Design a protein around this ligand. Sequence first.
Ligand code: HEM
Ligand code: HEM
Ligand SMILES: C[C@H](O)[C@H](O)C1=Nc2c(nc(N)[nH]c2=O)NC1
Ligand SMILES: C[C@H](O)[C@H](O)C1=Nc2c(nc(N)[nH]c2=O)NC1
Ligand SMILES: NC(=[NH2+])NCCC[C@H](N)C(=O)O
Ligand SMILES: NC(=[NH2+])NCCC[C@H](N)C(=O)O
Ligand SMILES: [Zn+2]
Lengths: 409, 411
Amino acid sequence: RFLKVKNWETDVVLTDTLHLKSTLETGCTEHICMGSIMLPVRTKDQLFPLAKEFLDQYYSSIKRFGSKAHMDRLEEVNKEIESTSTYQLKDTELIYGAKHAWRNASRCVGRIQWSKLQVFDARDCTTAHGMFNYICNHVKYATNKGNLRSAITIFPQRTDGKHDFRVWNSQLIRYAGYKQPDGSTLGDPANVQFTEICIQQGWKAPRGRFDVLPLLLQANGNDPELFQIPPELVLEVPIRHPKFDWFKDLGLKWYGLPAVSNMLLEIGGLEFSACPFSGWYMGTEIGVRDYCDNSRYNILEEVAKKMDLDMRKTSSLWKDQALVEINIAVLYSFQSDKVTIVDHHSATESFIKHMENEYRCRGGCPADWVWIVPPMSGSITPVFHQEMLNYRLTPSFEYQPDPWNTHVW
Amino acid sequence: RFLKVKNWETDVVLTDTLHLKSTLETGCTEHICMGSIMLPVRTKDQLFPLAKEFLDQYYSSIKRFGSKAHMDRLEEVNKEIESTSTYQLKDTELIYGAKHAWRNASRCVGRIQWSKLQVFDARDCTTAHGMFNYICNHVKYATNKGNLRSAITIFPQRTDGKHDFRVWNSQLIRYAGYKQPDGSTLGDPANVQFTEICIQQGWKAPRGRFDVLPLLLQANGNDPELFQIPPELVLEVPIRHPKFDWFKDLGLKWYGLPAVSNMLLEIGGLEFSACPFSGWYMGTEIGVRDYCDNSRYNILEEVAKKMDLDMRKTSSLWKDQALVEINIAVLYSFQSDKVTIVDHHSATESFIKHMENEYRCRGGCPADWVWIVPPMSGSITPVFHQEMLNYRLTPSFEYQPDPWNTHVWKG
Ligand code: HEM
Ligand code: HEM
Ligand SMILES: C[C@H](O)[C@H](O)C1=Nc2c(nc(N)[nH]c2=O)NC1
Ligand SMILES: C[C@H](O)[C@H](O)C1=Nc2c(nc(N)[nH]c2=O)NC1
Ligand SMILES: NC(=[NH2+])NCCC[C@H](N)C(=O)O
Ligand SMILES: NC(=[NH2+])NCCC[C@H](N)C(=O)O
Ligand SMILES: [Zn+2]
């Protein structure tokens, strides 16, 4: 009932009670752990309990648990639900829910910043053009000339499912991927399919290695539309090393704004299917995963050669030496151009502090160890030695099917 | 109920049916994952079934399920259990049992070698001196002058819980750790407590940074006894770098034979509390964990200074740069001295092939992602991109409480 988690480097021990308020499932069972598996309309009856659960925590957080205001609101929503078969959050509730969905994102290592989220209420939106407008504003606000500010823009909630708003891109800003005759892939292999769906939709791909994709926005259930982000609004960083002048020749660069756009935000049973959010990169995401993953830009060998390393034998650890240099370069390019970015050491140290604050002030902090530990130098970051308990709390950010596998044109 | 795991790098999908045979628990529920938690006598009543499951697995493995030899063995074992409250395993079954405990060890990335385990049957052992002799033969055999051979020595199983055989060391070979009055630690911090027990037992500590610990052996539930492993039997490797001539001057070295000796081997319900086993090292174990954990030798700074790295700000990734070098040094030193060792790339690539083979021929491969993925360069090794299912199958290697915490001293 009262679980404890120990850090094996410091011997510190925290007790977890917050998991007791766990609602959703984990994919695991007393017989099998699926901790490493990436992916382990509501009715009136289904809804009220959720709204109740939510309002309870909301009012509890504002020190008015069981107050008249609390009871009243619970009644109004209750009425509104029974009548409209749904309800609307007050702005206060929307903001609170979004911040807490971030607070509860067990896979996010940057949650120490959770309370500082800027929320853009786009619930009055009605068209793809409106969506494009809201998104551009989000992009500009959050980029802030390189001094990034976390934000989320929330489009209209789901109703009957046949009027859902959806951003087809996986991130607001991402490079394109095209399958060349060579059999090889040009650009970002991860977006090869999306890149094609834009074309299948009219986009005029410049077939480059770093082409900013176009937004494919879906409003109120209608078929999606394309819009190119004002180039002047997409901050980019040219990747150069602080010692290897040959580096720039690799012809690499990355965008400064990471902005997940394909997730679903659930607040009090309500579902917001279009809720793009952004923060700032942790160095390794680009340097380790986007650049070195075999299925991404897969650039290790190329950088290996340029460094003139004995790639004849794995045991020489050339991949490791290169990986490091590459990551020193990403953090260098960003820091030079004055674009916010955080290294895995500093980011993990913060998460640990955040975990401690969360444990004493909330009785816990759900965290997914498999995602929290950086893809490089694992054990030399504090989170590696930190036991973590993963569980689902709501409000939350959830995965949802790609729209192009659901859209009934 | 079939379960699928995908490799997000190759899009290869495997199907697991083997987890259905999983009886033991995981620590996780439908509402919580404890996948990253380090540590989440039997009665006749509970033994019969365990013995039967085992014999059934055994006889099926040899294609004699239902045979008369199978049926007679079950009758023989059950009679014996009801008769003595326990039972003895045949030699063939012990070997099969030991090999499968290794095959089922979800935290071991070296399992592609599981069928080539050399099993030393020390069930006739009765005294600590007897244990010392067995252990000495195990080390020499396994060390094989640097061309390491995986092996396990199995001492008498547990009976009433008061006559246990235990190896108090956590590994047959490990360096002493000494707490200094100024608060600093000399040697390996991980073994300070055990070192104190050895000194209290009479060991004369040479108090250096790499002193090989004595064996503390408990036979038949008696008080443990000290024994020094013959120095000529302990193979060690001086650590140097293939390009930094100052590396050797750090004065580092490590032993070549890793031999976990504090686990419990469960087979057919029987409990073998003293079952030291060894294989060969994966570089990162030494280079990353033993050398760079803040709670171990913690050499990152010193190695960083000598490299004249910019230690002013973490974002220079000086810790990362130094880490790679140290690991290159460990692998290089071992290879030069011709002592068996495997790099993390090589080891993880083999585990993937092994895992795939196991799904196809066995229906699965219980694996602990948290432990399988190496402590450095995670995503540039295939295991990181591989989804895994973790569950407990028997025979198995289990953790057990430190003996000094449970032992009833006799004087
Ligand atoms: C401000 C700095 C932030 C940092 C440094 C940060 C860091 C991270 C990192 C390293 C990941 C893993 C990314 C991956 O492997 O794909 C992650 C995941 C995640 N973060 Fe953040 N984050 C930040 C802001 C945000 C914000 C503003 C939200 C939500 C409002 C958020 C919600 C989450 C969620 C839901 C995931 C999991 C996404 C998935 O499953 O792909 N993060 N974050
Ligand atoms: C052939 C060489 C072998 C290699 C390369 C290998 C590799 C590894 C590594 C890297 C780990 C994690 C070590 C740690 O982080 O402390 C591990 C754990 C494990 N291995 Fe092996 N192994 C080998 C042989 C064996 C043998 C012979 C057995 C058993 C008969 C075995 C049983 C296990 C067990 C039970 C664990 C978990 C130990 C614990 O929880 O501390 N391994 N192995
Ligand atoms: C299979 C496994 O779940 C997958 O390869 C992982 N992906 C990720 C991870 N961690 C982060 N932060 N991001 C990922 O995409 N840990 C492991
Ligand atoms: C808390 C966390 O489970 C712990 O720090 C871990 N230890 C280990 C690990 N993996 C291996 N191989 N060995 C460990 O000791 N993964 C994580
Ligand atoms: N720090 C963030 N906000 N990350 C969002 C996900 C970005 C993704 N990991 C990438 O490298 O493109
Ligand atoms: N490859 C092995 N057999 N390892 C056994 C565990 C050794 C332990 N990790 C060490 O660094 O000493
Ligand atoms: Zn689990």
